[PDB]
């Protein structure tokens, strides 16, 4: 034990030295506590006469026996400071936080208790109350254990999905600090459900992935909540994440403890389309580019964020990895817990790791052009 | 099922 620390710190030294030719932007910020979660808010402000734009991030804390917070931070990007705008008292670490597309003041969170919380961040003071009391705007009941998966329906305002270690997926309709019981509980998985995500176009369709190694496709119009529409043996270990391609309605991607990202076609789930290989450990997040249909990213325990270009599947080569691996981000020296593609600046990513580091970065233009 | 690390301040 502890030779690893020498290996990591030497590799970080090579990385640091090479950033001027690998990146168009690298901002590093040390949070007071690590964040398990990261999501860019949709808004950008471009003040007249300035050399920067102002973007914003939903973050959380993970403490060891100290008061946690849901956090909104501001980031200045050039055409660059990072500041905390608000902290709201949160009961336990923030497993995951996601804004509601139809009203981005509304943020859902996953707690270490079974509760899923809803905050309207405009209804909370500037400074958190030092009493420490968590006053969520809604408490969403239905789970028996904590989890990670959290998804707002982009086509039905207020329909929230959640995945838990209790083997279940819960659905709430918040549209009517009260307690809401789950509208529907889906019980098809036989193990910890790691992630859940609505389809971006079809208001009734969602996907889940679990430690049973399965990708499941659900339809809310089905009377049978114990059996999905489709059930796919997706990976040879736990499936930790999924993400629907925002330009291609039949395409999705899953990330796994088997160290691979799988590419799927909903119309024929018996045949995995491709397996993206290069991660050296468990994958916990995968996300498609909001700007480029063929671009996907993945991160996890190997301390790397990989960016893939599926248009390069099959091309010939002289190498250090397959042709579809566009970029390896090696800026983190600990496990990466989450990342978010900036929706207003193509190729900007924010990524957060267990050693308190948040990085906002952009690979060099010549790497993708 | 993920196992969260022990968080360190600063």
Could you tell me how many CB contacts below 8 A there are between chain A and chain B? 34
CA dist A25 and A2 (Å) reads: 31
CA dist A312 and A290 (Å) reads: 19
CB atoms within 10 A of CB A165: 19
Q: Are A79 and A350 in contact (CB under 8 A)?
A: no
CA dist A329 and A305 (Å) reads: 5
CA dist A366 and A361 (Å) reads: 15
Q: Which of A30, A62, A66 sits opposite B4 (nearest CB)?
A: A62
For this experimental structure, what is the resolution in angstroms?
2.2
Cβ–Cβ below 8 Å for A93 and B4: yes
Cβ–Cβ below 8 Å for B5 and A148: no
**B3 in contact with A at a CB cutoff of 8 Å?**
no
Torsion of CA A227, A232, A233, A238, to 10 degrees: -80
CA dist A248 and A293 (Å) reads: 7
Report the candidate in A128, A96, A122 with the shortest Cα–Cα distance to residue A109: A96
Structural domains in chain A, CATH included, are 1-369 (2.130.10.10)
Report the candidate in A150, A42, A48, A172 with the shortest Cα–Cα distance to residue A103: A42
CA dist A237 and A239 (Å) reads: 7
Sign of torsion over alpha carbons A266, A262, A99, B6: positive
Q: Which of A33, A211, A354 sits opposite B9 (nearest CB)?
A: A33
Check residue A45 and report its DSSP letter.
B
A93 neighbourhood in chain B, CB within 8 Å = 4, 7
Close Cβ partners of A357 (under 8 Å, ≥ 6 residues apart) = A28, A29, A30, A31, A331, A332, A333, A334
Which DSSP string corresponds to A123-157? Answer: GS-SSPPTT-----SEEEE--SS----EEE-TTST
Sign of torsion over alpha carbons A266, A271, A273, A275: positive
CA dist A239 and A217 (Å) reads: 14
Which DSSP string corresponds to B1-10? Answer: ---PPPP---
Check residue A248 and report its DSSP letter.
-
CA dist A239 and A286 (Å) reads: 11
SS3 label, residue A244? strand
CA dist A172 and A33 (Å) reads: 30
Cα–Cα distances in angstroms (integers) from residue A252 to residues A61, A172, A180, A330, in the given order = 30, 24, 31, 25
Q: Are A190 and A237 in contact (CB under 8 A)?
A: no
Q: Are A328 and A304 in contact (CB under 8 A)?
A: yes
CB atoms within 10 A of CB A46: 10
CA dist A153 and A359 (Å) reads: 28
CB atoms within 10 A of CB A126: 7
The A-side interface with B (CB below 8 A) comprises 30, 32-34, 36, 62-64, 66, 93, 148, 165, 192, 194, 211, 238, 240, 284, 334-335, 354-356
CB atoms within 10 A of CB B3: 4
CB atoms within 10 A of CB A129: 12
Residue of A29, A32, A34, A60 to mutate, testing the B interface (most B Cβ within 10 Å of its Cβ): A34
CB atoms within 10 A of CB A64: 13
CA dist A167 and A28 (Å) reads: 37
Cβ–Cβ below 8 Å for A36 and B4: yes
The phi and psi torsions of A92 (rounded to 5 degrees) equal: 85, 170
Torsion of CA A343, A344, A346, A350, to 10 degrees: -60
* Minimum CA–CA partner of B6 in chain A: A64
């Amino acid at each position: 034990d502890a030779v690893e620390e020498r290996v990591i710190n030497e590799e970080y030294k090579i990385w640091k030295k090479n950033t001027p030719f690998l990146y168009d932007l690298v901002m590093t910020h040390a949070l007071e506590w690590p964040s398990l979660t990261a999501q860019w808010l949709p808004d950008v402000t471009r003040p007249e006469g300035k050399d920067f734009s102002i973007h914003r991030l939903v973050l959380g804390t993970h403490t060891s026996d100290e008061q946690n917070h849901l956090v909104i931070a501001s980031v200045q990007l050039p055409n660059g400071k990072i500041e905390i705008e608000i902290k709201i008292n949160h009961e336990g670490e923030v497993n995951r936080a996601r804004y509601m597309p139809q009203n981005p003041c509304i943020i859902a969170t996953k707690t270490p208790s079974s509760d899923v919380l809803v905050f309207d961040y405009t209804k909370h003071p500037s400074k958190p109350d030092p009493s420490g009391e968590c006053n969520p705007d809604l408490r969403l009941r239905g789970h028996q254990k904590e989890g990670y998966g959290l998804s707002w329906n982009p086509n039905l305002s207020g329909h929230l999905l959640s995945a838990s270690d209790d083997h279940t997926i819960c659905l709430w309709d918040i549209s009517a600090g009260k307690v809401v019981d789950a509208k529907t509980i889906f019980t098809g998985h036989t193990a910890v459900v790691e992630d859940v995500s609505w389809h971006l176009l079809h208001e009734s369709l969602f996907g889940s992935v679990a430690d049973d190694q399965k990708l499941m496709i659900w339809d809310t119009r089905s009377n049978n909540t114990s059996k999905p529409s489709h059930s796919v043996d997706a990976h040879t270990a736990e499936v930790n994440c999924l993400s629907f391609n925002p330009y291609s309605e039949f395409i999705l991607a899953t990330g796994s403890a088997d160290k691979t990202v799988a590419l799927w076609d909903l119309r024929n789930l018996k045949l995995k389309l491709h397996s993206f290989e290069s991660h050296k450990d468990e994958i916990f997040q995968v996300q498609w580019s909001p700007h480029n249909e063929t671009i996907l990213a993945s991160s996890g325990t190997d301390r790397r964020l990989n960016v893939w270009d599926l248009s390069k599947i099959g091309e010939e080569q002289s190498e250090d990895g397959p042709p579809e691996l566009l970029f390896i981000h090696g800026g983190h020296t600990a496990k990466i817990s989450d990342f978010s593609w900036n929706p207003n600046e193509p190729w900007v990513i924010c990524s957060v790791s267990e050693d308190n580091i948040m990085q906002v970065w952009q690979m060099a233009e010549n790497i993708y052009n | 099922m993920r196992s969260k690390g022990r968080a360190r301040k600063l």
